[PDB]
Design a binder for this molecule. Sequence first.
Ligand SMILES: Cc1cc2nc3c(=O)[nH]c(=O)nc-3n(C[C@H](O)[C@H](O)[C@H](O)COP(=O)(O)O)c2cc1C
Ligand SMILES: Cc1nc2c(C#N)cccc2n1-c1ccc(C(=O)NC2CC2)s1
Ligand SMILES: O=C(O)c1cc(=O)[nH]c(=O)[nH]1
Length: 378
Amino acid sequence: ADPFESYNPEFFLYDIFLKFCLKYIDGEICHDLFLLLGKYNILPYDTSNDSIYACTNIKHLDFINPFGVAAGFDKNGVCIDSILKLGFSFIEIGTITPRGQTGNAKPRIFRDVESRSIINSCGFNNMGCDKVTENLILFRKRQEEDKLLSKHIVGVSIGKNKDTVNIVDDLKYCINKIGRYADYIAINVSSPNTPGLRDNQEAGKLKNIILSVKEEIDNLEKNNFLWFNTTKKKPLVFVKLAPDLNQEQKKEIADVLLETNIDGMIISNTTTQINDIKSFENKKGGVSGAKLKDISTKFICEMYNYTNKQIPIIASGGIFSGLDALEKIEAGASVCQLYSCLVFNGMKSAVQIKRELNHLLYQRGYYNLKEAIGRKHS
Ligand SMILES: Cc1cc2nc3c(=O)[nH]c(=O)nc-3n(C[C@H](O)[C@H](O)[C@H](O)COP(=O)(O)O)c2cc1C
Ligand SMILES: Cc1nc2c(C#N)cccc2n1-c1ccc(C(=O)NC2CC2)s1
Ligand SMILES: O=C(O)c1cc(=O)[nH]c(=O)[nH]1
């Protein structure tokens, strides 16, 4: 790929445009501008074949490379194709809710370039389960005609509308509408921006949530070719956890995860523990990026040991480099999700991080990425 060709994600003009937008334009306007470029398929694309030695898996989920885009980036599944073609193996769309929501008062997204941090108080703004399902169906039909997207994975993050009293009613509604089209379902009980959502991480409540979601997915088969997704199998079930939990809570959750046989755990969502970023002093919400890296890596180590290495991990939190990715993997993660990396590193994010990790796996003496999983604990 030529360095001065516009189709190349590493093309210098992308970093110039991004640096300008990061300096002078409102955060959510930048994000919506990126989604618009994606929607009209004007984004650059990765033309390199991914290394077979950096492939990974979670059960039957075969990731072509270890990098995906975390939930909350393409909330409505409006440009799945364009984001994936930047060089990512998967994307988690959503978080979606049964009815659409505009979310919390704007401005609600703020970036701190020096510390590579983001604070947000979005509050699950999305078009609603029915409209997002239409968007995902359209992608599944495009994927069926395009061989280049046949191995890319799409997960769906599901949550509850703000006014819903019982979360399970909302999760069931989403499963019944979008479940048939998802490779995996991520249960979001960790947003800090929906009042009382995090209370669902209590052991007793979480167990009922997991068993009800699993029962609802299992009933799609019982009541009714059926799977219009990548795997051609029922979606796996993941739980996304908050890093703001005590040791007693983490241990109780781990015991529930082992008993309910969850397919994976996403570690982690944003934190409410970071109070040292000056430009975020009077801002509300959860913090993402570099200040979240150490907290979430420590949380991966803890959960990997609490679950006795039986539950696969999806890493989320401050991953910017090949070095950051390897640290997550040796801590116990099987795959990585990026968010803040796309915001601060731009279009080149996937191409660059994949190169850095392949080089690092070679320097460290690993034959493949699978050999590195949980190696800190070996
Ligand atoms: C503006 C914004 C919106 C987000 N929305 C969601 C969401 O809807 N669902 C979710 O599970 N996580 C959401 N997240 C959390 C990210 O998926 C991710 O876990 C977090 O940003 C930490 O990763 P990072 O340090 O690489 O950014 C959001 C993050 C940001 C910055
Ligand atoms: C990767 C990228 N590239 C661009 C370009 C370019 N080139 C122009 C405008 C926005 C761009 N982006 C962004 C995508 C998302 C961005 C962002 O700031 N998101 C909000 C949640 C924090 S900034
Ligand atoms: O929509 C949001 O506010 C949101 C959801 C989530 O899970 N995490 C986050 O930081 N923001």
